[PDB]
Design a protein around this motif. Structure first.
Motif, PDB file in Angstrom:
ATOM      1  N   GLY A  18       0.791  -1.078  -0.027  1.00 40.91           N
ATOM      2  CA  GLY A  18      -0.094   0.150  -0.107  1.00 40.91           C
ATOM      3  C   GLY A  18       0.778   1.179  -0.010  1.00 40.91           C
ATOM      4  N   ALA A  19       2.131   0.910  -0.137  1.00 36.82           N
ATOM      5  CA  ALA A  19       2.993   2.372   0.056  1.00 36.82           C
ATOM      6  C   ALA A  19       2.753   3.379  -1.089  1.00 36.82           C
ATOM      7  N   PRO A  20       2.946   4.814  -0.724  1.00 40.40           N
ATOM      8  CA  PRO A  20       2.950   5.612  -2.020  1.00 40.40           C
ATOM      9  C   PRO A  20       3.776   5.212  -3.322  1.00 40.40           C
ATOM     10  N   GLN A  21       3.345   5.731  -4.384  1.00 45.70           N
ATOM     11  CA  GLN A  21       4.074   5.426  -5.634  1.00 45.70           C
ATOM     12  C   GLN A  21       5.358   5.796  -5.713  1.00 45.70           C
ATOM     13  N   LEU A 134       0.273  13.018  11.101  1.00 44.08           N
ATOM     14  CA  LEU A 134       1.282  13.076  10.163  1.00 44.08           C
ATOM     15  C   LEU A 134       2.637  12.775  10.245  1.00 44.08           C
ATOM     16  N   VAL A 135       3.030  13.170  11.544  1.00 44.09           N
ATOM     17  CA  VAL A 135       4.219  12.881  12.134  1.00 44.09           C
ATOM     18  C   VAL A 135       4.246  11.170  12.007  1.00 44.09           C
ATOM     19  N   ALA A 136       3.175  10.503  12.657  1.00 43.71           N
ATOM     20  CA  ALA A 136       3.484   9.126  12.820  1.00 43.71           C
ATOM     21  C   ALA A 136       3.228   8.351  11.303  1.00 43.71           C
ATOM     22  N   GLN A 137       2.730   9.061  10.279  1.00 40.51           N
ATOM     23  CA  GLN A 137       2.594   8.456   8.963  1.00 40.51           C
ATOM     24  C   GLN A 137       4.127   8.584   8.601  1.00 40.51           C
ATOM     25  N   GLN A 138       4.862   9.628   8.756  1.00 37.27           N
ATOM     26  CA  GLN A 138       6.235   9.822   8.401  1.00 37.27           C
ATOM     27  C   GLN A 138       7.163   8.728   9.023  1.00 37.27           C
ATOM     28  N   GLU A 139       7.071   8.695  10.236  1.00 35.33           N
ATOM     29  CA  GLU A 139       7.898   7.597  10.809  1.00 35.33           C
ATOM     30  C   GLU A 139       7.505   6.106  10.508  1.00 35.33           C
ATOM     31  N   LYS A 140       6.196   5.982  10.363  1.00 36.98           N
ATOM     32  CA  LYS A 140       5.756   4.606   9.900  1.00 36.98           C
ATOM     33  C   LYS A 140       6.138   4.325   8.279  1.00 36.98           C
ATOM     34  N   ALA A 141       6.149   5.498   7.474  1.00 34.62           N
ATOM     35  CA  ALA A 141       6.815   4.861   6.060  1.00 34.62           C
ATOM     36  C   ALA A 141       8.337   4.625   6.145  1.00 34.62           C
ATOM     37  N   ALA A 142       9.184   5.505   7.057  1.00 33.59           N
ATOM     38  CA  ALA A 142      10.544   5.240   7.126  1.00 33.59           C
ATOM     39  C   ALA A 142      10.701   3.788   7.846  1.00 33.59           C
ATOM     40  N   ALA A 143      10.090   3.638   8.935  1.00 33.96           N
ATOM     41  CA  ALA A 143       9.988   2.366   9.569  1.00 33.96           C
ATOM     42  C   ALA A 143       9.927   0.920   8.622  1.00 33.96           C
ATOM     43  N   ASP A 144       8.830   1.111   7.800  1.00 33.58           N
ATOM     44  CA  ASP A 144       8.403   0.294   6.868  1.00 33.58           C
ATOM     45  C   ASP A 144       9.709  -0.200   5.950  1.00 33.58           C
ATOM     46  N   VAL A 145      10.751   0.543   5.639  1.00 33.25           N
ATOM     47  CA  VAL A 145      11.904   0.078   4.696  1.00 33.25           C
ATOM     48  C   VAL A 145      13.130   0.213   5.573  1.00 33.25           C
ATOM     49  N   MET A 153      14.818   7.203  -2.311  1.00 34.78           N
ATOM     50  CA  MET A 153      13.521   7.442  -2.913  1.00 34.78           C
ATOM     51  C   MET A 153      13.267   5.762  -3.143  1.00 34.78           C
ATOM     52  N   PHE A 154      11.807   5.611  -3.039  1.00 31.51           N
ATOM     53  CA  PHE A 154      11.433   4.072  -3.073  1.00 31.51           C
ATOM     54  C   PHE A 154      10.184   4.535  -4.273  1.00 31.51           C
ATOM     55  N   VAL A 155      10.101   3.402  -5.091  1.00 27.96           N
ATOM     56  CA  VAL A 155       9.159   3.385  -6.096  1.00 27.96           C
ATOM     57  C   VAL A 155       8.157   2.133  -5.730  1.00 27.96           C
ATOM     58  N   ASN A 156       6.825   2.479  -5.781  1.00 26.88           N
ATOM     59  CA  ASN A 156       5.830   1.240  -5.424  1.00 26.88           C
ATOM     60  C   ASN A 156       6.181   0.572  -4.334  1.00 26.88           C
ATOM     61  N   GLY A 157       6.665   0.772  -3.232  1.00 22.48           N
ATOM     62  CA  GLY A 157       7.170   0.206  -1.915  1.00 22.48           C
ATOM     63  C   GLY A 157       7.993  -0.860  -2.535  1.00 22.48           C
ATOM     64  N   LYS A 158       8.760  -1.184  -3.633  1.00 18.10           N
ATOM     65  CA  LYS A 158       9.248  -2.393  -3.946  1.00 18.10           C
ATOM     66  C   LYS A 158      10.981  -2.125  -4.396  1.00 18.10           C
ATOM     67  N   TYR A 159      10.957  -0.948  -4.819  1.00 15.15           N
ATOM     68  CA  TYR A 159      12.378  -0.516  -5.557  1.00 15.15           C
ATOM     69  C   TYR A 159      13.004   0.950  -4.748  1.00 15.15           C
ATOM     70  N   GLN A 160      14.203   0.739  -4.547  1.00 16.57           N
ATOM     71  CA  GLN A 160      14.966   1.738  -3.937  1.00 16.57           C
ATOM     72  C   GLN A 160      16.137   2.237  -4.867  1.00 16.57           C
ATOM     73  N   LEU A 161      15.914   3.657  -5.133  1.00 13.85           N
ATOM     74  CA  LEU A 161      17.033   4.079  -6.107  1.00 13.85           C
ATOM     75  C   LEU A 161      18.145   4.049  -5.534  1.00 13.85           C
ATOM     76  N   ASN A 162      19.144   3.878  -6.588  1.00  8.37           N
ATOM     77  CA  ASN A 162      20.643   3.459  -5.981  1.00  8.37           C
ATOM     78  C   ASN A 162      21.586   4.529  -6.709  1.00  8.37           C
ATOM     79  N   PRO A 163      21.503   5.885  -6.364  1.00  5.53           N
ATOM     80  CA  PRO A 163      22.314   6.935  -7.077  1.00  5.53           C
ATOM     81  C   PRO A 163      23.737   6.778  -7.099  1.00  5.53           C
TER      82      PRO A 163
END
Length: 188
Positions: A18-21, A134-145, A153-163
């Motif tokens: 369910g992650a942000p795109q 909204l603070v909790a939402q930010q913390e949870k998104a970070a915790a999830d990964v 940067m994460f895409v569709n909760g599946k891929y992490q950019l590797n700059p």
């Protein structure tokens, strides 16, 4: 291939439901984040290569800057709640990293006041339950990964950019490689 797992991106062993795109993490204490924002304009350049129908999310993180780091995550919650991100992002970066005039929650508040956000409006948001969540939402998104570094940067909760797997001789070329990679991952 041209895009390969482990070069321009990595794949999350533990995909996130369910992650942000398109999800970006940053810290106002983070030097590459300052660069990403004011020098590279990464978010802006990604957005203009992204598909119709894809929203972009950007969250602040706690793990840099101690007490002030957490204050900045709450301030960013206020920014999101009031919809004033584009008014405070640059002065917050400059306040923390350039002039180093942000040393306390009150100095953060000053940035918003100077940006034209009314004091009573700022204080009401800061203390609000909507901002708490909204603070909790930010913390949870970070915790999830299990986020340990920014910028990220994460895409569709599946891929992490590797700059780190991108050329840095040229800044323009870096930005477009970054953006094109995001577009690729999003279409995947």
């Amino acid at each position: 291939a041209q895009y390969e797992d482990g070069k321009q991106y990595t794949t999350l062993e533990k995909p996130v439901a369910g992650a942000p795109q398109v999800l970006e993490f940053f810290s106002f204490f983070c030097p590459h984040c300052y660069q990403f924002e004011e020098v590279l304009h990464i978010s802006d350049n990604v957005k203009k290569k992204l598909p119709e129908g894809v929203k972009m999310t950007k969250y602040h993180v706690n793990f840099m800057g101690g007490d002030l780091g957490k204050d900045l995550t709450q301030a960013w919650a206020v920014a999101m709640a009031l919809g004033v991100e584009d008014k405070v992002t640059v002065p917050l970066f400059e306040g923390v990293q350039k002039t180093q005039t942000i040393r306390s929650a009150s100095d953060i508040r000053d940035v918003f006041i100077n940006a034209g956000i009314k004091g009573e409006e700022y204080d009401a948001a800061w203390n609000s339950f909507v901002v708490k969540s909204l603070v909790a939402q930010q913390e949870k998104a970070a915790a999830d990964v299990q986020l340990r570094g920014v910028p990220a940067m994460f895409v569709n909760g599946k891929y992490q950019l590797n700059p780190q797997g991108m050329d840095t001789s040229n800044m323009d070329v870096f930005v477009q490689q970054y953006a094109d990679t995001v577009k690729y991952l999003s279409e995947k």
